[PDB]
């Protein structure tokens, strides 16, 4: 029930988009918010995110990388901004990418916190 995690991420009303995306072997969106951006994330875009070469695009949306610690052990998260702009945080679990976009005026620190904590939750189930 991957949509449950999307629903919880979208519950407080301060996030406008969220997604859980598998990146092993054949990247694909496992769950996202319909009619938004992250539902259109391509495997090619995922490849950029988890690649060795470290703007970028997420489902067509041009983004600017603020802080990249995604492949970094202990953190595994990346903060971006849509090129009114919105804070974006991507966090890497054992098999997925958790993506979170905040609404206007929402702190990047909050989006990072929510995404980071949601990813820790997923890792507890070995995902």
UniProtKB/Swiss-Prot annotation:
Expressed in epididymis (at protein level). There is a cross-link at residue 52 (Glycyl lysine isopeptide (Lys-Gly) (interchain with G-Cter in ubiquitin)). Changing residue 63 to G: In ALS18; the mutant protein is detected in the insoluble fraction of cells. GO terms for biological process: actin cytoskeleton organization; modification of postsynaptic actin cytoskeleton; modulation of chemical synaptic transmission; negative regulation of actin filament bundle assembly; negative regulation of actin filament polymerization; negative regulation of stress fiber assembly; neural tube closure; positive regulation of actin filament bundle assembly. The modification Phosphoserine is found at residues 26, 77, 125. The modification Phosphotyrosine is found at residue 116. Pfam families: Profilin. There is a cross-link at residue 52 (Glycyl lysine isopeptide (Lys-Gly) (interchain with G-Cter in SUMO2)). Found in a complex with XPO6, Ran, ACTB and PFN1. Interacts with ACTB. Interacts with VASP. Interacts with HTT. Interacts with SH3BGRL. Occurs in many kinds of cells as a complex with monomeric actin in a 1:1 ratio. Interacts with ACTMAP. This is Profilin-1. It comes from Homo sapiens. The gene is PFN1.
């Amino acid at each position: 029930g991957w949509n449950a995690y999307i629903d919880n991420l979208m519950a407080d009303g301060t996030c406008q988009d969220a997604a859980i995306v598998g990146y092993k072997d054949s990247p694909s969106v496992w769950a996202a918010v319909p009619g938004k951006t992250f539902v259109n994330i391509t495997p090619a875009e995922v490849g950029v995110l988890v690649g060795k070469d470290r703007g970028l695009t997420l489902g067509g949306q041009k983004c600017s990388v603020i802080r990249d610690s995604l492949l970094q052990d202990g953190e595994f998260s990346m903060d971006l901004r849509t090129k009114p702009t919105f804070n974006v945080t991507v966090t890497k679990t054992d098999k997925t990418l958790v993506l979170l976009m905040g609404k206007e005026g929402v702190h990047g620190g909050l989006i990072n916190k929510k995404c980071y904590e949601m990813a820790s939750h997923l890792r507890r189930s070995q995902y």
